[PDB]
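dumping this here so i dont lose it again. seq + smiles for potassium ion
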Amino acid sequence: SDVFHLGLTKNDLQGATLAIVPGGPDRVEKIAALMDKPVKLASHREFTTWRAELDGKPVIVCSTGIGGPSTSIAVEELAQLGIRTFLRIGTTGAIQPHINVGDVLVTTASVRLDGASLHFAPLEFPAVADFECTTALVEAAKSIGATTHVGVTASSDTFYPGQERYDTYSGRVVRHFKGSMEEWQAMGVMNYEMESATLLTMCASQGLRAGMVAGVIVNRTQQEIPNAETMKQTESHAVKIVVEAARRLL
Amino acid sequence: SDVFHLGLTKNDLQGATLAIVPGGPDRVEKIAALMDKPVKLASHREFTTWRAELDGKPVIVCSTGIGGPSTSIAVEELAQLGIRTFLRIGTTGAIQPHINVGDVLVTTASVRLDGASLHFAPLEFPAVADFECTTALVEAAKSIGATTHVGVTASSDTFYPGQERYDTYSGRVVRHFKGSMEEWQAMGVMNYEMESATLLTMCASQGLRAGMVAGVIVNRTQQEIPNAETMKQTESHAVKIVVEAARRLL
Amino acid sequence: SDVFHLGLTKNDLQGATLAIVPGGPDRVEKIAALMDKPVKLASHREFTTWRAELDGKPVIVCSTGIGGPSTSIAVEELAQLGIRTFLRIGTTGAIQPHINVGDVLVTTASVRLDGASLHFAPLEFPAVADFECTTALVEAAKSIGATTHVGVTASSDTFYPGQERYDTYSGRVVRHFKGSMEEWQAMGVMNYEMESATLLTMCASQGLRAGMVAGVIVNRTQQEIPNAETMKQTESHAVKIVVEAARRLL
Amino acid sequence: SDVFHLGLTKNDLQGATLAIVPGGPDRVEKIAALMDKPVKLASHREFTTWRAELDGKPVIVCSTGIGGPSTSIAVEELAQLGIRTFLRIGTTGAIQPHINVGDVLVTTASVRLDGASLHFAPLEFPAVADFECTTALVEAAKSIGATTHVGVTASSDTFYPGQERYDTYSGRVVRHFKGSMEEWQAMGVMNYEMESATLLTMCASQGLRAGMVAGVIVNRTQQEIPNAETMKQTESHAVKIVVEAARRLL
Amino acid sequence: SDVFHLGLTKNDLQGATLAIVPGGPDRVEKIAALMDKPVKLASHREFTTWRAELDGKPVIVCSTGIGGPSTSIAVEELAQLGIRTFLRIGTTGAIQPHINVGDVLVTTASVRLDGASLHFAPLEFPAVADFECTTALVEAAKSIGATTHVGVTASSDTFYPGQERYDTYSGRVVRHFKGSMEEWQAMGVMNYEMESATLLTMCASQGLRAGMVAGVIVNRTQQEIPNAETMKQTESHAVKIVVEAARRLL
Amino acid sequence: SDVFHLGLTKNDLQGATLAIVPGGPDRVEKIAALMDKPVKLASHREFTTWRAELDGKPVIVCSTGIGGPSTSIAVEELAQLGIRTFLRIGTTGAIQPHINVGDVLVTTASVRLDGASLHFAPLEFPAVADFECTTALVEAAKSIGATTHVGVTASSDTFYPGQERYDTYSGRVVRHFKGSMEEWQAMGVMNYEMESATLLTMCASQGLRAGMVAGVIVNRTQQEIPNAETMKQTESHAVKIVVEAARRLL
Ligand SMILES: [K+]
Ligand SMILES: [K+]
Ligand SMILES: [K+]
């Protein structure tokens, strides 16, 4: 390997300069298998990497793991291997009543409720997406008729207390996070997820391009158990969007 | 007057929902002059307001004064009078070597070196521009052939120490700000100015749209003294851009 | 001009070393017209400057604009033109039940709810008035029989959320400021205004003298609509106080 | 699955109440192999879980992934499945000159350079290990003749800037972290790693027991490249220690 | 004197390397009088120092005064006189329902609600006890059959608001401390006291050993007025524990 | 005793409402000796209290101990016993070149480098002295011909690192404090001491009056070792001043 964690060499990327970065290994394969000549490059730790080809150009798909720390490793090491543009795709829960299940969210910037972002810039620096990445994601969403919302995402270092879940071992949320969700919702924040504050700050502060899209599988203000088919469909639409954005950015 | 500071009634705006918001009263007249049927509404404190018409729709031009506090009053009061979209235009000094005098900067989000932003959202919330305003401004800039840079601005509550100016009465900059400019340069920040962290945070957290464009009049990394014609022609150019963007947002 | 914003040259001040600094341009003229040989020097942006003469000595009167950012510009540039003492005068709303409309408040130090003060000293540094300025203001108040309170002022970068006003576009105050007014009132804070934390910190940390007086036109704990005559009278008394303090400091 | 991420049911754990929690899935199998009746339970995302038996009692081995966010999910979900005791084992780089390759570190508490710890306790709360776990780990280490150091670890949300690595894409470390390593060295901090501030804070504040041991594979103050056998033998040693400590805690 | 405050010379310690450090002067004599050859060395300010002999080795007993500032003086100056291990003993109020009056608490680490600790390490650094000191204290407690709890202590710079006492002059607790006790209790914190955050941080960060034991004289969740005999007895048991720990550490 | 720490009953104070509060018990007797009918009340911990009579009115003299925590107890308990006015007197080291040995400093407000102030007001609140106490102290100083400086003091929770002393056990000062002295010097801060940020913040936020004077015994910018007579004569002078100020406040 040329890098400490990912198990990749430079020539494995075959000159690729853009990576799609979902959180989980299983989603990596789903994305790669929508492109041409997909091949699995490595699986080490939370980092599963495939390569594929979009209109004859190599693209990398690499899982970050959950959370800013592992995201920050994957981004640094892909950047040492020549990636310059990073597009995150996820599935997510909306926290606004007007957002419906199956809609698509493109994130302009994130609330920094993480710690890794601070290791690249002080908290005053905005966790903001690159404008060409956000443009390409919005255009790609439009290209398939998706209902798209464009706006702020809250990016949390935890899945449970940081997102005000109370059905937990302790049933407790620390005072600084208790009632925080209501604050984000009053400020128009669309959803929570767990990697973007890190991803967007570290790229924006390091002259790398990054952007994020997600499909909505649950709305916590009108909460239903998701249907398996609907989740598969929404995941696939967000996967097409991020791939089509990739095509516009190359 | 329907509001505490600006000296305006609801009727004065004639149903306008968009305002262009420069910092100084003198630029208000320059902008309103590009549009049809320009009329002066009011001048109180740093707040000078004109109305004009663009493609048959009324549009407001109102000066903010320097800094987040006066900006916060102008935006709140114009929101109570029905403004939903706010476009800031300025002239500015670049802090990157690759940006030239006469180029145009469109701000995707700002470093919050201000205090009024904190009165609307905690510091972890991004001072992020509206995507439709940012798109309208970049497209407008490209439409008249501007050389355009799109990215992060540092937004300071001072002109002098917070922008690391040392030719001052004391010649001193407080420890937290000394060497901060080199940090923002390393992080790819384009420029400093003094109203956008407040304007962008307050609009983003209250469901108002905002965006900002500026024309470059000096580069601090290769600093030349500008002549009056350079400054006038750069101001004209940014003013043309912001009016063209207002046209696409109406 | 010798300075970037104010439009003043050194010799325009005719050797003046003290400036009275109200927030608004209209009040500048009212103060200057109580002294001898008043002349308007400049009006640019929020900065309206007059000169006058008190017992044969030149005094400057210069509006700061609203907020610490513009205050910080006016102070720095007047200091480069030789001013060493700065007295702010305002009209204000009291937040304590025992303070009556028409009473006079002299501020010993301010709660720093601003951002510009941080560009001169870290938050632990007190936004404290010069003792000879505060002495002269208290003595001047006594010299006209005013009812005087001497104590702390809360200095906010916003007029609306920072002062817990809820009759606003959004009707919302961010969590960190919601219930803050009750905290200041329990701590004996007399009133809010919007320039003193900046003014007092930047002078105290730069070896310039500063102090502040204000007349009370409303009490928010027993809130009445002010009468026009009472406001004019209270404004004039505070204007006499600051001028008489000026006379004692020269 | 009874839980959102790990892919486990309550029955799968067979009444286990103790888990050894390494960072990577590959080490899970190495640890489970030392114990009796090792069986694989589940592998989802960075979470690989085996069960085995120690002195006739079932014990869990589950990988956390890198960083506090994924660690926080694994601990919460294993707590909902009845785990009350969590023992982290790793390999690590020392930052003190007196620590040698092959020595073992047991962590009494950690410097919180992470973000997920903040989602359980404010920063003033100590990221402190359980005394019984720490005792079991030191006694286990001394039991096989390890050279043992017991003390403070720095726990970072990044591998690169937060541990002051400069051979990176940017070669830059943000101001707050530049020179931080020399501060932790002066303060007697033993090492860096990336999960313990979260693991220890969340357990200490929720009535769960946790502790951590690690084997030293590199010393950054006298840095040698390790061979594969050094790394395997150091890992074996720490793995033997953590299983021996689990035996004393059952 | 060889030091600024304590009034001690180096040779007065007769080679002692360990100090027992209670808060009050009266307790100093009680401890020294349980050892051999006790002699009073000095009483200056809050700093009363005795020497005595444990199994033929000199030990110092030195009051810190109340609070981190005076603790930090006594620790620095005893360290300049050769002390390397510092054991604090106190009497305390428990804040957990399961802790009984007459039980003994050994502190693993402290919540840092003080200011002096910040003058040795940033807030992220844990106020953690030395593991050999905490071991010796737990073993010493066991050696006399005491009921022992081992865990976190909240260390406050105030006795009244910081510990949420409301029967005070003002009856007020500042917002940041109002409802804090309930947070510590939900996080398992055992008790409050006023010197350990300073003591533990400054020693842990300076390569000195420190630990703390206390006997419980009141439980604030089931609050009774303490009986004089019970307080004397519990004090004596904690004094024996700290002396017996001293013996194990020499 | 009516209070937890000081060993005083309400009757002991004989209706006194003013206290002079030096740091050390030994200075209590020196101050009480200047007044009429001096009597010792109590000595517990660092708290030594005498009563005496000034112009026929009873006055209290009570030592605070070193640092905000013990100061906070003394002020709270003396407030419960009816003290409304507190005058601190000390001897101190100047940090400005223009201040001489034997000069007197009166403190208008303090830099909050302490922790107990935070238990009464958030850090943005000024640690400001009462105007009547400050006036009485300056007038008293001028009344006996002192050379008087009036201005800002830095108030530290430590004697050693927080005042940048390096001839210590470690010889190290933590990053946040290293170079802080030069910042306070640049900002015109007169001196360091260790009780006023707490004394002034707690009194200012609870409607109690406080002020502080000190005599200069060393100048750190031109540091001479003082002889015993210099120290005694400087102490006498400040003690005379504080008693004279108490006379004007009764
Ligand atoms: K992870
Ligand atoms: K302004
Ligand atoms: K003390």
